[PDB]
Design a protein around this ligand. Sequence first.
Ligand SMILES: O=C1O[C@H]([C@@H](O)CO)C(O)=C1O
Ligand code: NA
Length: 129
Amino acid sequence: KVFGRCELAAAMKRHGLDNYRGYSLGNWVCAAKFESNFNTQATNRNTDGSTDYGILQINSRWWCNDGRTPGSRNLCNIPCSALLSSDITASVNCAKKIVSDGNGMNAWVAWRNRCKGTDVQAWIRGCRL
Ligand SMILES: O=C1O[C@H]([C@@H](O)CO)C(O)=C1O
Ligand code: NA
């Protein structure tokens, strides 16, 4: 599923992301834009052999089992494919674990490089929330 911007904002808000660990909703929307272009089906292979999955490009090295990432972990206790569903629940629950891991949203390279220090509230502007 490819989300509209405001559609994803509302879904993220309903799933408890707005100010989760102090990151306002716009941060999450901005991350999702630059990680996946709002597409739940996005996958991208990493140089180390792991793969990133879903709207927040959660990686198989640590967070999910894709059956092909030797010596990796499954810290969210889920098959990576669950991160591709049109229901974002798994991606949200797993994101919450990630953002609590010590580095906050810096865990998302694209957040740090495209969203951090920018006017992230622009991403939820005009949305009914
Ligand atoms: O993604 C993973 O891949 C391996 C295994 O399933 C295949 O090597 C593993 O233990 C994971 O969490
Ligand atoms: Na894994």
